[PDB]
Design a binder for this molecule. Structure first.
Ligand SMILES: Cc1cn([C@H]2C[C@H](O)[C@@H](COP(=O)(O)OP(=O)(O)O)O2)c(=O)[nH]c1=O
Ligand SMILES: Cc1cn([C@H]2C[C@H](O)[C@@H](COP(=O)(O)OP(=O)(O)O)O2)c(=O)[nH]c1=O
Ligand SMILES: OC[C@H]1O[C@H](O)[C@H](O)[C@@H](O)[C@@H]1O
Ligand SMILES: [Mg+2]
Ligand SMILES: [Mg+2]
Lengths: 370, 372
């Protein structure tokens, strides 16, 4: 196979596919990443090769039955459809040059389904996490991209061959069509094993990690409310994982607090009792895979679903909206509840077990073959 | 479930040789950590891997292990590696205690990994990067210097490895290298970008020149400058020169029929090339061989003479075996013309490529490591 990988221009979506890209390559197949500038460093930082392509929190994301919730998801499909069309010439040329035989495509990167349709190539969708694109998004996607595909002789945007799904079924949106399961492998970037990452401490270790993309969109509030909530509680040791660009957000920290700057989470998370995060699937799924419960402050897109379904399975707590997130008493009480009740860790382990019972990226390569 | 600690020598290409196996391990749910000195940090991270921090030419005597001078060169290499093993054992023991690996994946030359395996009673899987000339003089000096050491810790002597993994095409492997289990070479040449011109050949005769960073640091400019002059003088030739950034200031007044490809992964374009001119480092040379591309090899050190000799005997290239040959411009030019005028070189290189493709993929080797 020559597998051309087409993600939306968000690091997490491409990182979700990185262990499968590596399984494909360790299996003999070729792999190229269609990468806009926002994905270049991510792609290369995983040892992969590329072709160059040129308000919060908002709970309505998690409410597709609302007027506002329907509108947000349609608006996303509309923006993506538009730029898919803008970019189709470029992607056609790339496919001419490199001649892929399969397209491995982000569920949200519609460009990929059009390309599959137009070039008659089989299309393998890949979910990055909780997938809430049924209904509003997917309907709007057909209504906008149906025409171009019919112009080329198809009935419409086609249904994909296969949809790979790293999300444990238990957490998956209830209306997401059946995918083919694949075990989540926590790829969190390259980096260094920290000395203190080897064992827990007598302290209650709490990791805060909001990721780059979230805070650029939200401003510092969710990180800084998390730091305020965690360090207040007696006996907690805060581990704060930030990219270099957000290190200066952190001014006055207690003495036992640790700044972990660009340190892959999976390297130390097992020494932690709690993750405070925003529901971004790279931090969140690495925690759940390592059986660590979470306190989730969702902001946008699929984060509210993930936080809801996580809490429903008992493996964490959601702060659902601006009223909850801005309330230091609820924030701190939520941390104290998780630390004081080992039923959270127990639920989280149960989910870790759901994940590790799933076929690994290695096993999926044969599915892709067929 | 394994926790695999990887113990390379501080040479990028030895680590790069293991990158596809590391990916395979991770892709099948295991954990992998690279014990990296400073020189390895960027290669490990550049492949997506995580690290624990640690810490004249050509010379034909390297392929003359049956002579005094050859034996001395491999012995000093084993001496240097044994001495660093004693320097660094304390960090490695602290790391193994910290991370608790269940198996060590060790560069054949990284003597520390065998010591560590002995001391902590962990299986050691050795990994060759290519042709392995370490039997006899190197291995003897290793046992001589480390046997007493491992005895001082209650062991038998430097342990025998549980398993040796070998990507080298078997018809090209040193005759005295002990048997290793086959693992198919996958061309990992680093990250980077698909060049527009790499899609298809042109009417020109495309010849890639790639000497690696390691080589040019040791040799200076000569082998590059020799290959550029020899290739661009021949009429009909287009030279694609793969150079890392710190070496690009070596080329000046580049002719019209020369192209600089700075850190572009070879596998991205190599299929459009009719010949590869290199020093015989396995990353360049196995990528070429994998693609059935013949090579003109200017060996300089270590395993390069053996690879160059054995590739020439297979018919899959030409060796310039020493300084008088590599600096004979007219013989160098004639050798390029010879390969370009005779498709038998390519056909011989496809035969070697069929050996590689008969080897199990890194993915299949995951099962073997689990059973070790
Ligand atoms: C800042 C930081 C991120 N990461 C990783 C965790 C995830 O794999 C990824 C961030 O993904 P994620 O949490 O999904 O979303 P976003 O990047 O918008 O926040 O980066 C670390 O492992 N360590 C760090 O210090
Ligand atoms: C300089 C350069 C190297 N490479 C790769 C090919 C090999 O995988 C690796 C070099 O390794 P190798 O040829 O084994 O030895 P040395 O580094 O001393 O020449 O770097 C490229 O793909 N493109 C480049 O431009
Ligand atoms: O599972 C049911 C709920 O999940 C979805 O994610 C929607 O946003 C909400 O409309 C729906 O009622
Ligand atoms: Mg405060
Ligand atoms: Mg043999």
């Amino acid at each position: 196979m020559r597998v051309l990988v087409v993600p939306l221009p968000y690091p997490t979506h491409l990182m979700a596919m990185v262990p499968l890209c590596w399984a494909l390559q360790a299996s003999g197949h070729e792999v190229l990443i269609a990468a806009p500038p926002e994905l270049q460093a991510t792609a290369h930082g995983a040892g992969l090769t590329t072709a160059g392509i040129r308000r919060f929190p908002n709970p309505a994301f998690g409410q597709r039955d609302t007027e506002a919730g329907r509108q947000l998801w349609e608006q996303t499909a509309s923006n993506v459809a538009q730029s898919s069309l803008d970019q189709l010439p470029e992607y056609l040329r790339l496919a001419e040059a490199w001649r892929p035989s399969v397209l491995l495509v982000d569920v949200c990167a519609l460009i990929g389904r059009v390309l599959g349709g137009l070039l008659d190539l089989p299309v393998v969708l890949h979910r990055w996490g909780v997938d809430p694109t049924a209904g509003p998004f997917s309907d709007r996607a057909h209504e906008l991209l149906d025409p171009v595909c019919r112009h080329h002789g198809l009935t419409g945007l086609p249904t994909p061959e296969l949809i790979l799904d790293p999300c444990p079924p238990s957490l998956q949106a209830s209306d997401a069509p059946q995918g083919a399961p694949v075990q989540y492998v926590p790829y969190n970037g390259s980096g260094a094993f920290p000395a203190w990452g080897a064992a827990r401490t007598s302290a209650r270790r709490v990791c805060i990690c909001m990721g780059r993309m979230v805070l650029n969109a939200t401003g510092p509030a969710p990180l800084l409310r998390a730091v305020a909530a965690a360090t207040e509680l007696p006996g907690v040791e805060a581990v704060i994982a930030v990219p270099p660009e957000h290190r200066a957000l952190l001014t006055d920290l207690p003495d036992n607090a640790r700044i972990a700057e660009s340190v892959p989470l999976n390297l130390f998370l097992r020494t932690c009792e709690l993750v405070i995060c925003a529901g971004g699937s790279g931090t969140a799924f690495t925690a759940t895979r390592l059986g660590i419960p979470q306190l989730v402050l969702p902001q946008y897109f699929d984060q509210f679903d993930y936080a809801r379904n996580l809490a429903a399975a008992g493996a964490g707590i959601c702060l659902p909206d601006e009223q909850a997130q801005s309330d230091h008493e609820q924030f701190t009480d939520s941390i104290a509840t998780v630390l004081g009740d080992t039923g959270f860790a127990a639920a989280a382990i149960k989910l870790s077990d759901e994940i590790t019972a799933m076929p690994h990226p290695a096993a999926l390569v044969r599915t892709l073959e067929n």
